[PDB]
Amino acid sequence: PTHLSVDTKFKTEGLCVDIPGIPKDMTYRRLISMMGFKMNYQVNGYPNMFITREEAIRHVRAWIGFDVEGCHGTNLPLQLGFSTGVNLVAVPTPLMYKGLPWNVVRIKIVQMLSDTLKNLSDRVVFVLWAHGFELTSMKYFVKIGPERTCCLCDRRATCFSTASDTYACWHHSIGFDYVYNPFMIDVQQWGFTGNLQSNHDLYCQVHGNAHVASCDAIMTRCLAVHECFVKRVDWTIEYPIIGDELKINAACRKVQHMVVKAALLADKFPVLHDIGNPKAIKCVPQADVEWKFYDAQPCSDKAYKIEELFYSYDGVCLFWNCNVDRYPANSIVCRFDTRVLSNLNLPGCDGGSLYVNKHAFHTPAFDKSAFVNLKQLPFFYYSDSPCESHGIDYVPLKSATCITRCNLGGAVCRHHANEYRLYLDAYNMMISAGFSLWVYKQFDTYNLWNTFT
Numbered sequence: 482p483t484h485l486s487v488d489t490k491f492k493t494e495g496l497c498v499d500i501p502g503i504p505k506d507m508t509y510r511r512l513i514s515m516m517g518f519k520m521n522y523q524v525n526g527y528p529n530m531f532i533t534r535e536e537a538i539r540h541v542r543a544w545i546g547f548d549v550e551g552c553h554g555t556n557l558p559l560q561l562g563f564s565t566g567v568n569l570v571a572v573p574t575p576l577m578y579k580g581l582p583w584n585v586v587r588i589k590i591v592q593m594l595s596d597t598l599k600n601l602s603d604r605v606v607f608v609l610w611a612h613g614f615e616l617t618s619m620k621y622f623v624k625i626g627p628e629r630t631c632c633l634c635d636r637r638a639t640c641f642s643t644a645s646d647t648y649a650c651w652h653h654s655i656g657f658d659y660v661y662n663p664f665m666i667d668v669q670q671w672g673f674t675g676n677l678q679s680n681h682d683l684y685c686q687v688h689g690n691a692h693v694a695s696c697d698a699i700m701t702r703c704l705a706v707h708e709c710f711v712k713r714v715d716w717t718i719e720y721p722i723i724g725d726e727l728k729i730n731a732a733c734r735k736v737q738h739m740v741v742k743a744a745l746l747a748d749k750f751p752v753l754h755d756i757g758n759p760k761a762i763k764c765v766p767q768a769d770v771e772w773k774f775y776d777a778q779p780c781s782d783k784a785y786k787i788e789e790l791f792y793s794y795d796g797v798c799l800f801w802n803c804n805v806d807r808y809p810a811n812s813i814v815c816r817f818d819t820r821v822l823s824n825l826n827l828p829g830c831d832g833g834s835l836y837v838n839k840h841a842f843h844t845p846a847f848d849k850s851a852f853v854n855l856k857q858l859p860f861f862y863y864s865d866s867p868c869e870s871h872g873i874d875y876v877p878l879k880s881a882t883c884i885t886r887c888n889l890g891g892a893v894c895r896h897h898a899n900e901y902r903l904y905l906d907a908y909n910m911m912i913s914a915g916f917s918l919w920v921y922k923q924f925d926t927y928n929l930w931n932t933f934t
């Protein structure tokens with residue numbers, strides 16, 4: 482039980498307003514045949530165009546919401562909407578394009594999917610709220626067959642070209658006209674009462690219904706993200722490395738150790754209250770401080786209410802990726818900014834985003850008002866390690882934010898210049914990934930200079 486059986490029943494009630502008289506009894510096998518696709522009894526890696534919810538969750542990076550609305554049925558034009566915000570009008574002869582025949586529309590579809598997905602996934606998963614026209618449009622821009630490899634590289638083929646009779650991945654499909662072996666899932670198969678808008682609006686107020694196909698496509702994908710990543714969470718599922726995951730994660734641990742160590746040296750808190758991940762380890766194990774841990778799993782729906790985390794109840798509080806409505810004034814905070822544009826950050830539900838780095842984390846919408854009792858933490862590098870080289874060429878470092886014994890003495894040593902530059906790169910990596918750092922208002926790096934006396 483890893484793939485969806487073609488002999489599984491498909492509920493057709495949602496399809497009957499576009500396809501009246503459709504049989505109530507139907508399998509994926511008959512549906513695919515009626516869609517105009519021939520599977521020919523083929524065991525060549527593509528057993529079904531449709532996938533299970535479990536397979537869709539593993540390929541969340543491939544998700545593209547797709548809706549088709551009748552503009553006027555082979556006689557009338559269709560409006561194709563995608564969760565990228567693109568609307569294309571195909572004539573049978575928030576960006577809205579004028580009516581064009583399928584031979585040119587299919588070229589635009591391939592270009593758009595390739596530009597969106599090349600740095601995200603090895604495939605496309607059309608996320609539908611199927612009513613009929615969207616499935617009947619597929620024969621006009623999709624070709625299927627055995628699993629193939631790209632003609633210019635080792636990646637699986639996602640596109641086909643009728644001009645050259647060749648196959649390409651999302652990176653090498655320029656000039657290609659067909660989407661090859663796409664996958665799809667109909668959200669209506671999961672069991673819902675009422676229409677798309679009524680189910681979507683129960684959980685999200687950010688996506689409106691401007692009455693166009695792309696709005697429906699965005700709502701459909703948003704509803705699926707809510708069902709799979711908000712109301713249900715699975716932190717065991719592993720996702721492949723597609724970018725700077727490792728460097729970001731290493732930078733996060735380096736920055737956390739730096740900031741907490743410096744806050745303890747500068748303000749000498751007798752106790753640190755570490756709130757968040759129940760598997761947390763002391764980030765500054767050599768510090769004198771009394772370290773107390775409080776368990777809170779990552780919140781995927783709404784930010785935690787501080788009144789609930791503290792059970793309505795000195796030292797400093799550490800909230801490292803623990804999303805709360807309003808941080809206490811005595812805090813050290815790392816909060817992911819959901820607005821960040823990156824290949825790891827997918828659009829989410831109700832302003833939230835789906836951050837995918839080894840595991841998927843639906844993160845509640847970034848809110849500047851959560852940080853009203855704090856200030857932004859400025860960049861600084863602190864080190865009490867010996868000034869000694871051991872082991873790239875050099876230009877002497879001059880920086881007011883290199884808090885070291887050698888800088889206090891008037892000339893930064895080669896070791897601390899190298900470590901400062903490595904730390905600044907890690908810091909910039911973490912910030913550009915979307916993380917934001919906040920600290921108690923009394924934090925002052927000037928208090929770190931007397932640790933070298």
Ligand SMILES: CCN(CCO)c1ccc(N)cc1
Binds near residue numbers: 504512516
């Ligand atoms: C959704 C696919 N489709 C439209 C033509 O491709 C269709 C499905 C079932 C029946 N019985 C007739 C038509």
Ligand SMILES: CCN(CCO)c1ccc(N)cc1
Binds near residue numbers: 794
């Ligand atoms: C900020 C630390 N703190 C008060 C110390 O006793 C606290 C934290 C969590 C709960 N649940 C209660 C209290």
Ligand SMILES: [Zn+2]
Binds near residue numbers: 631632650651652
């Ligand atoms: Zn390729």
Ligand SMILES: [Zn+2]
Binds near residue numbers: 681686688831
């Ligand atoms: Zn939404």
Ligand SMILES: [Zn+2]
Binds near residue numbers: 867885886894
């Ligand atoms: Zn030094």
